[PDB]
Amino acid sequence: ENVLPREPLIATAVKFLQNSRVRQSPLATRRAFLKKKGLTDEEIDMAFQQSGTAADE
């Protein structure tokens, strides 16, 4: 499944998101992206909650 909820994923995700362009990248990408990378639904809002996007969750 690969989608095993892991904190290392969150850390890598937050880095990814707030690196530069990902914050400006549409969530249409970001949603499928994190979920396919291995983050469950819970984890994807976790990463976005920590990074603080607060837009189209």
Binding site: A13, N19, R21, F33
Partner: peptide, 12 residues
């Protein structure tokens, strides 16, 4: 490449 940006950056 933006595609690689999703890959390389999230790889590590």
């Amino acid at each position: 490449s933006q595609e690689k940006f999703f890959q390389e950056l999230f790889d590590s």
